[PDB]
Ligand binder design. Structure first.
Ligand SMILES: S=C=NCCCCCCc1ccccc1
Ligand SMILES: S=C=NCCCCCCc1ccccc1
Ligand SMILES: S=C=NCCCCCCc1ccccc1
Lengths: 114, 114, 114
């Protein structure tokens, strides 16, 4: 599972432990071992959401499976919750794109997961 | 709809108003209220297009619907037009990836659009 | 074909000529003229892989065709090879997402490749 968050929130406002918390909570949510979870936080971005530049985030979650109607609603509750708590971003200023990747289309360690 | 542009054009060459113009014009082009539209501009990137580091851009437009053959051609004319006028990037050094997102695969406000 | 590398490796550790090398190597690998190839390297990122912030990379390869089970395995060996050789990133700390793009969903030069 790979989670990326792009946000206009300043780097200094990203708290200690945020990548670790994301990793741990994604492990819990996706059922995957933390050793295979990747997280990427990109602060200080030039962004607007609804035409304004109050704190916002554009995110993506890629996963081989564990993507679907109910699962994505659960991820969104979790991830918006963390963004609101830790980065003070309102959940209604967050988009998260979910991608169900075919194992043959994810490269790792000189090969793919197929 | 979410629009991201990554470019090697420096920050100082991004004109005032650019995020707002992108928002307005995307609202016009997609027929969606600007409150729905997110835009993200990433300047100063280490990029090459055709092996050359002349100004270029790699972009994406994700949308829940309003993606298709003719529509994408129209978006490309619009967006290349804006990048050429505002950032002085040649349209033949622009790629724009279009993604038709399922509502269930876009999170927002603790849930999804499903 | 468009190749993006996001990494926590510092900018200074990205060798001169890396973008050109990626371009030439992808050109050979995809059997496409280098004029078609775009590359984007993003160093100094705040990233974790497996809960660790040792050097790692999250990458994507978008291509109109030339994506598939065996081809992706070949790309992974190639690209992990380059990342290990040039950026000193272990191949088991690299993910590469492969995307087979429809021609109608790639904008270029005021239109699309449709
Ligand atoms: S995207 C993200 N990760 C990329 C693919 C992860 C496969 C998990 C392997 C694995 C999963 C569960 C139990 C044992 C091993
Ligand atoms: S991405 C951008 N903005 C997000 C739009 C959320 C409302 C989708 C409406 C909608 C749902 C289903 C089919 C067509 C339209
Ligand atoms: S992404 C990268 N470079 C962009 C490629 C533009 C020409 C597509 C040719 C092409 C069209 C249809 C099927 C196969 C090949």
């Amino acid at each position: 599972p790979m989670f990326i968050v792009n946000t206009n929130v300043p780097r200094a406002s990203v708290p200690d432990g945020f990548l670790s918390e994301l990793t741990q909570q994604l492990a819990q949510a996706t059922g995957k071992p933390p050793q295979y979870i990747a997280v990427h936080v990109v602060p200080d971005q030039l962004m607007a959401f609804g035409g304004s530049s109050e704190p916002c985030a554009l995110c993506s979650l890629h996963s081989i499976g564990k993507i679907g109607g109910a699962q994505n609603r659960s991820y969104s509750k979790l991830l918006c919750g963390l963004l609101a708590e830790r980065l003070r971003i309102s959940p209604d200023r967050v988009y998260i794109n979910y991608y169900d990747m075919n194992a043959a289309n994810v490269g790792w360690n000189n090969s793919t997961f197929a």
